[PDB]
Amino acid sequence: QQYVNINPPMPSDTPGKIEVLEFFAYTCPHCAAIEPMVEDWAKTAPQDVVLKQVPIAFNAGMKPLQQLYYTLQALERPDLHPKVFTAIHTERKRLFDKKAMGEWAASQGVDRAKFDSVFDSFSVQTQVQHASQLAEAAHIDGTPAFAVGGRYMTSPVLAGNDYAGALKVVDQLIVQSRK
């Protein structure tokens, strides 16, 4: 009813843990709205569950925003991740290409040369490719969306058009994923 099956199931990337993938995009207003609720949910999630946030690209212009996510993670600035949403949606900053992104990161204390180097790195390119591979295998059709255990997919729309309802379904799917 409030979720769909992923067939064939996706293989697990975290032994002994149930993976929850939140597929998101920085440009998605609902991803921005749900982000603090996801961060709060992650604080109380079961210890055998791991949350991964996976940036997606439905058109090629979204690929720099995938690179931005993995660049901030590689620079060990996860504090800047929620601030990207705020900068784009509340402060109306146009953080849509590498140049604007690097200027914004530099204003946040990131060395510009390191940002630019990491943004172009093979490691980031591989993570972006993997993010799009995961979205393809999970049969993504919008954001925000949640894949649970590599086997089930839900979203606020599927869970009765409600953010908290989506996370309640995620909780139900976690129990199901343990069998």
Residue numbers in the entry: 1 to 179
What does the study report here?
In Gram‐negative species, these bonds are introduced by the Dsb enzyme family, with DsbA acting as the primary thiol oxidase. B. pertussis' single DsbA (BperDsbA) (Heras et al., 2009) and DsbC (BperDsbC) enzymes have been shown to be essential for both the formation and stabilization of the pertussis toxin (PTX), a major virulence factor in B. pertussis infection (Scanlon et al., 2019; Stenson & Weiss, 2002). Notably, it contains a highly destabilizing catalytic Dsb, resulting in one of the most oxidizing redox potentials recorded for a DsbA enzyme. Functionally, BperDsbA shows limited substrate promiscuity and selectively catalyzes the oxidative folding of a pertussis toxin‐derived peptide, supporting a model of substrate specialization.
The structure of BperDsbA was solved to a resolution of 1.65 Å using molecular replacement and refined to R‐factor and R‐free values of 16.87% and 20.16%, respectively. The asymmetric unit contains two symmetrically independent monomers, both encompassing residues 1–179, which superimpose with a root‐mean‐square deviation (RMSD) of 0.432 Å across 179 equivalent Cα atoms. BperDsbA shares the canonical DsbA‐like architecture (Martin et al., 1993) with a TRX‐like core fold defined by the conserved motifs β₂α₁β₃ (residues 19–63) and β₄β₅α₇ (residues 130–179) separated by an alpha helical insertion domain. This insertion includes a three‐helix bundle (α₂, α₃, α₄; residues 64–111) and two additional helices (α₅ and α₆; residues 112–129). The active site includes conserved catalytic residues, with the CXXC motif (C28P29H30C31) located at the tip of α₁ (Quan et al., 2007) and the proline loop (G142T143P144) bridging α6 and β4 (inset) (Ren et al., 2009). Although the protein was oxidized prior to crystallization, the structure revealed BperDsbA in a reduced form, likely due to radiation damage. In this reduced state, hydrogen‐bond contacts were observed between the sulfur atom of Cys28 and the main‐chain nitrogen atoms of Pro29, His30, and Cys31 within the CPHC motif. Additionally, Cys28 forms hydrogen bonds with both the main‐chain carbonyl and side‐chain hydroxyl group of Thr144, a residue located in the cis‐proline loop (G142T143P144). Furthermore, BperDsbA exhibits an unusual surface electrostatic distribution, characterized by a positive patch directly above the active site and a negatively charged groove below. BperDsbA also exhibits notable structural differences compared to class Ia DsbAs such as EcDsbA, including a restructured β5–α7 loop that produces a narrower peptide‐binding groove more consistent with class Ib DsbAs (McMahon et al., 2014; Santos‐Martin et al., 2021) and distinct surface electrostatics.
